Every structure is written in C-alpha cells, then in structure tokens.
Amino acid sequence: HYARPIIILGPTKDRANDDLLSEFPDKFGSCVPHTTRPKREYEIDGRDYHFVSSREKMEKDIQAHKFIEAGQYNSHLYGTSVQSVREVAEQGKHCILDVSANAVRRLQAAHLHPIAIFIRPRSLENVLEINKRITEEQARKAFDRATKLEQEFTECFSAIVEGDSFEEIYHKVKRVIEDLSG
C-alpha cells in the first residue's frame, strides 16, 4: 500500500538500479518529471512530463522546496517533484531514484522515509573489481567521490554495504530493501 523510495549511492549504483528494476518489474517504479517547456505534439502530459504551462509557478515551487532536483536547459526548467515521487510511493511501488545525497536529505525532510543505501568501496582496487567496465582514470574519481560522500552524508544512509564482487554488493542491497520494506 505504501513503498519507500530507494536511492542507491556509491559506485555500481546505476547497475544495481538497473538489475533490481530488471528483476522485479512489478515491485519498482519510476516517477514522472516536470518541465516548463511547451509539450510536443506526440508528447503526453502526465507520462513524458507534467508540463507546467505557467513557468512562474514552477520557479516559485522550486523556491518552496517542492523539488528534490532541478536545472535549466534551453531556458526551460526541469525537475523531479517531491509529490511526483510520493505518487509512485502510493501505488505500492518502490521509486528508484538517480539523485544526489542532498536530494536524499530533502526526501527525508519531507518525512517521505526513503531507503538510502550507500555502497562503500573498500579500496581503489575494489573499485576496479566490483565495477564491470571502467578504466583506472575513472576509478580514482569514483573512489575519491565515494570517500568524501560518506564523510559528509553518513547520517542520512539507511545502510552501508560492501563486497569484493558486485554480486555480493547486489545481494546485500536486496537484503537492505528486504529488511526495511515491511
């Protein structure tokens, strides 16, 4: 009846999202973004985007802390609303989110109660192992971003998981969701 949105953080998160999405189609869902850009002919409001005809209203709502993530392109605003994520939460679907940890803090300030799982790399070498495709260049930036991000945002994670293989990481991610979904 109510399922908590999920944000996986750390290396390999996107693939954890993909494989969980790809493994339980019925359990996980996706939220619908907003856009102040005029809707296209073959675009569908409520499915491609909630199209805001009043751009002024969406700017004010962003300033009212109703979006967890936002940006501007070709003079148009795009964002994922606080309310659009709950709309998935009410269908009994877990909302898989590609959002920052600040965005996580904002879903908690809502009281939405989301599942924030952080994947801690053991070492730079662990980055190269748990991660299927990557070069040594990219691995350092990933290892250095994960270490700063835990030192800054530990207090907001529902769990921290580790593994020498991604399958071990992926299994513990499902263990977290399984313990905290009841």
Partner: peptide
C-alpha cells in the same frame, strides 16, 4: 535515471 537527454542536461 531519466531516460531523456533534456532532463539530464538540465541537471548538469
């Protein structure tokens, strides 16, 4: 993640 380039560019 949002499967639309426009949204991704906007958040960048």
């Amino acid at each position: 993640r949002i499967r639309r380039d426009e949204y991704l560019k906007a958040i960048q």
